[PDB]
Design a protein around this motif. Structure first.
Motif, PDB file in Angstrom:
ATOM      1  N   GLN A   1      91.193  54.365   9.790  1.00  0.00           N
ATOM      2  CA  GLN A   1      92.303  55.196   8.990  1.00  0.00           C
ATOM      3  C   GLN A   1      93.168  55.970   9.363  1.00  0.00           C
ATOM      4  O   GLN A   1      93.977  56.853   9.550  1.00  0.00           O
TER       5      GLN A   1
ATOM      6  N   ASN B   1      80.062  58.670  10.043  1.00  0.00           N
ATOM      7  CA  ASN B   1      81.251  58.362   9.584  1.00  0.00           C
ATOM      8  C   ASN B   1      82.486  57.761  10.374  1.00  0.00           C
ATOM      9  O   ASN B   1      83.774  57.259  10.159  1.00  0.00           O
TER      10      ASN B   1
ATOM     11  N   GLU C   1      87.904  65.935  -1.817  1.00  0.00           N
ATOM     12  CA  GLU C   1      88.755  65.587  -0.369  1.00  0.00           C
ATOM     13  C   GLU C   1      89.785  65.170   0.004  1.00  0.00           C
ATOM     14  O   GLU C   1      90.435  64.300  -0.304  1.00  0.00           O
TER      15      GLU C   1
ATOM     16  N   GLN D   1      97.052  61.881   4.011  1.00  0.00           N
ATOM     17  CA  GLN D   1      97.536  62.846   3.672  1.00  0.00           C
ATOM     18  C   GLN D   1      97.470  64.085   4.357  1.00  0.00           C
ATOM     19  O   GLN D   1      98.328  64.571   4.254  1.00  0.00           O
ATOM     20  N   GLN D   2      96.317  63.931   5.106  1.00  0.00           N
ATOM     21  CA  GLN D   2      96.676  65.226   6.292  1.00  0.00           C
ATOM     22  C   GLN D   2      97.078  65.140   6.837  1.00  0.00           C
ATOM     23  O   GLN D   2      98.421  65.748   7.126  1.00  0.00           O
TER      24      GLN D   2
ATOM     25  N   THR E   1      91.782  63.321   2.313  1.00  0.00           N
ATOM     26  CA  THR E   1      92.307  62.188   2.866  1.00  0.00           C
ATOM     27  C   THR E   1      92.753  61.905   4.242  1.00  0.00           C
ATOM     28  O   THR E   1      93.333  63.131   4.830  1.00  0.00           O
ATOM     29  N   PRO E   2      92.472  61.520   5.234  1.00  0.00           N
ATOM     30  CA  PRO E   2      92.581  61.582   6.773  1.00  0.00           C
ATOM     31  C   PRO E   2      94.695  61.445   6.423  1.00  0.00           C
ATOM     32  O   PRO E   2      95.765  62.387   6.967  1.00  0.00           O
TER      33      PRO E   2
ATOM     34  N   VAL F   1      86.468  56.226  10.075  1.00  0.00           N
ATOM     35  CA  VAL F   1      87.585  57.367   9.903  1.00  0.00           C
ATOM     36  C   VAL F   1      88.614  56.790  10.985  1.00  0.00           C
ATOM     37  O   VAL F   1      89.730  56.896  10.795  1.00  0.00           O
TER      38      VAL F   1
END
Length: 155
Positions: free
Chosen positions: A38, A31, A1, A6-7, A3-4, A35
């Motif tokens: 992050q 989560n 997946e 990376q998004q 990652t936040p 989250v």
């Protein structure tokens, strides 16, 4: 997946100049506690302010979206997961339609969103999935360096 963090770095290149992004986040998601930090870390690393509006019930989705749009004046909607409230098909349709009526893109966690009118999702290096007609209408740009790793998807 993907990652936040990376998004959000991808969002930074897809919407050059964006300064504030709004997240609708399911307060009940297992989560949540991991989250939310992050997202703050990603905001520091990218420089994009991430405004997270948590929802605890379906009845909170619309007022919290209104706060992101009207009060925080965010420039895009970012949905991270869909295990609970954000997997509710009325909430999904609502968020996509009302973001579109505000002329802002939706960055979404799966291709189902793109079929319903969201703009960009991601897969895994990283590959982008883009609803081209909607992305175009919402002001998304695909930089040269990511053109080879971008798939367009039909509505």
């Amino acid at each position: 997946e993907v990652t936040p963090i990376q998004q959000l770095f991808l969002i930074k290149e897809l919407k050059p100049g964006i300064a504030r992004i709004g997240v609708i986040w399911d307060k009940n998601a297992a989560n949540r506690d991991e989250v939310l930090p992050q997202l703050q870390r990603a905001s520091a690393a990218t420089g994009i302010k991430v405004v997270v509006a948590e929802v605890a019930s379906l009845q909170e989705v619309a007022p919290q979206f209104r706060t992101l749009l009207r009060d925080h004046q965010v420039e895009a909607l970012w949905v991270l997961e869909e295990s609970g409230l954000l997997g509710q098909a009325a909430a999904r349709s609502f968020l996509i339609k009302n973001a579109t009526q505000a002329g802002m893109p939706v960055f979404a966690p799966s291709e189902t969103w793109l079929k319903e009118g969201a703009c960009v999702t991601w897969r895994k290096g990283i590959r982008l999935v883009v609803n081209k007609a909607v992305a175009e209408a919402m002001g998304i740009t695909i930089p040269a360096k990511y053109q080879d790793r971008t798939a367009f998807l039909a509505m």
